[PDB]
């Protein structure tokens, strides 16, 4: 197989440092111009650093002097040592073999802030007094008060009518809801929303009624 895997991301205080790493199967880093790129909220990729096969390093002004890209040719590992981190550095960082047919990993999240990692509060959203109790019912789970943003809502895994809305920041904490739809002829069969928040190593399962 051929794949790149970034790791090392997480929460960091402004002015702090962090070291990202990248390993791969099927790609020999020493032979290429290897790079690091990052994806911020804007969702438009930004080049962070590159290192040629010759070992020459390249950096944009945005990180010049604070970031250092390096490679361990023997163990086949790519690194990105970050320092004097700024809030503007918050993003999803990708490791990439850009030449020819580009390859990149799933990315690793780096969050720079003083804020605290808070677990999510999950509240069930089901029909109560006087509702459209019939064919096709809209159920849901409200998730609020968490941080960082990365959170995943899964419905019995077999969810095809799910609608997970973009999380919104509120007073420093994120909030989002997820709705699901199923025919009333199967409502009394157990509908559960599983909220996962790796940031706080928390997973909350709420069974609607």
């Amino acid at each position: 197989e051929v794949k790149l895997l970034e790791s090392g991301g997480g929460l960091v205080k402004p002015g702090g440092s962090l070291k990202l790493s990248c390993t791969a199967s099927g790609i020999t880093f020493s032979r290429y111009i290897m790079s690091w790129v990052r994806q911020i909220p804007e969702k438009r990729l930004e080049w962070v650093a590159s290192i040629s096969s010759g070992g020459i390093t390249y950096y944009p002004d945005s990180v010049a002097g604070r970031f250092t890209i390096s490679r361990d040719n023997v163990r086949n590992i790519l690194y990105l040592q970050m320092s004097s981190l700024r809030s503007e550095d918050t993003a999803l960082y990708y490791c990439a073999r850009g030449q020819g047919r580009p390859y990149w990993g799933q990315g690793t999240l780096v969050t720079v802030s003083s804020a605290k990692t808070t677990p999510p509060s999950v509240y069930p959203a089901a029909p109560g007094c006087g509702d459209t109790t019939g064919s096709s019912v809209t159920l849901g789970c409200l998730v609020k008060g968490y941080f960082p943003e990365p959170v995943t809502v899964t419905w019995n895994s077999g969810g095809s009518s799910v609608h997970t809305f973009p999380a919104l920041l509120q007073s420093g904490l994120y909030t989002m809801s997820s709705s699901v739809t199923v025919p009333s002829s199967t409502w009394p069969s157990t509908v559960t929303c599983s909220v996962a928040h790796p940031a706080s190593s928390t997973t909350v399962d709420k069974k609607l009624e």
């Binding site: 111009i33 790079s35 790129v37 994806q39 969702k43 438009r44 990729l45 080049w47 590159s50 390249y58 944009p60 850009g98 030449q99 020819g100 047919r101 580009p102 990149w104 799933q106 990315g107 509060s121 509240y123 069930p124 959203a125 089901a126 029909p127 109560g128 007094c129 006087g130 459209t132 096709s136 809209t138 849901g140 409200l142 609020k144 095809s160 609608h163 997970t164 809305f165 973009p166 999380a167 919104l168 509120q170 909030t175 989002m176 809801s177 709705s179 739809t181």
Partner: protein, 214 residues
């Protein structure tokens, strides 16, 4: 730097027909070896970027031949034949001819379909939430089309515009519709001194605003 330019949007495309996404570079991407170093990738909501085409005309792994790219060294066109609902997302062109790596701003692919009214479902604060002092009322306006819509809140007949938060999804990869949620957040105290909350949704399809209250 080699600047890559694409329009932010393209006209809505009918399912089953072809879509064309343009892109241009400030410098030819045609290398001396005869290869043109242009690649295209796709970004769908909640997914990592996916390579579609590289070296101008080579399909990446798992990419159906409905996708193709053509053009010169500075002007290119990504073509998607027989557009499918799952094709919605943002298409990016980029160059890997030289450093520094540069990328286009991305072009969002819009799918045109038949109008649809929003399925509205409202929910009162949960008991578990009230026991903590909080009080947020939620209502979903799901699977509607077009994406243009507007929700209004009414507490005891009065309009409560303050304290409301709205969140919209991207075009659905399956049904090509849009969805959104409206959440009026307040203290359990403010919530108690009232009763009868209204989630009003006025679309442009019908003249009968679908309103739900409790």
């Amino acid at each position: 730097d080699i600047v890559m330019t694409q329009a932010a949007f393209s006209n809505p495309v009918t399912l089953g027909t072809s879509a064309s996404i343009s892109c241009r570079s400030t410098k030819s991407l045609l290398h001396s070896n005869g290869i043109t170093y242009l690649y295209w990738y796709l970004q769908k909501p909640g997914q990592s970027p996916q390579l579609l085409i590289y070296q101008m005309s080579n399909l990446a792994s798992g990419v159906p031949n409905r996708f193709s790219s053509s053009g010169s060294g500075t002007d290119f066109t990504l073509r998607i034949s027989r557009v499918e609902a799952e094709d919605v997302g943002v298409y990016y062109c980029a160059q890997n001819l030289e450093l520094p790596p540069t990328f286009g701003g991305g072009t969002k692919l819009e799918i045109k379909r038949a109008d649809a009214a929003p399925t509205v479902s409202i929910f009162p604060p949960s008991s578990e939430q009230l026991t903590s002092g909080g009080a947020s009322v939620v209502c979903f306006l799901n699977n509607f089309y077009p994406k243009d819509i507007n929700v209004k809140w009414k507490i005891d007949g009065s309009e409560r515009q303050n304290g409301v938060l709205n969140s919209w999804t991207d075009q659905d990869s399956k049904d090509s519709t849009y969805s959104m949620s409206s959440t009026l957040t307040l203290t359990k105290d403010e919530y108690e001194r009232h009763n009868g909350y209204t989630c009003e949704a006025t679309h442009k399809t019908s003249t009968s605003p679908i309103v739900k209250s409790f």
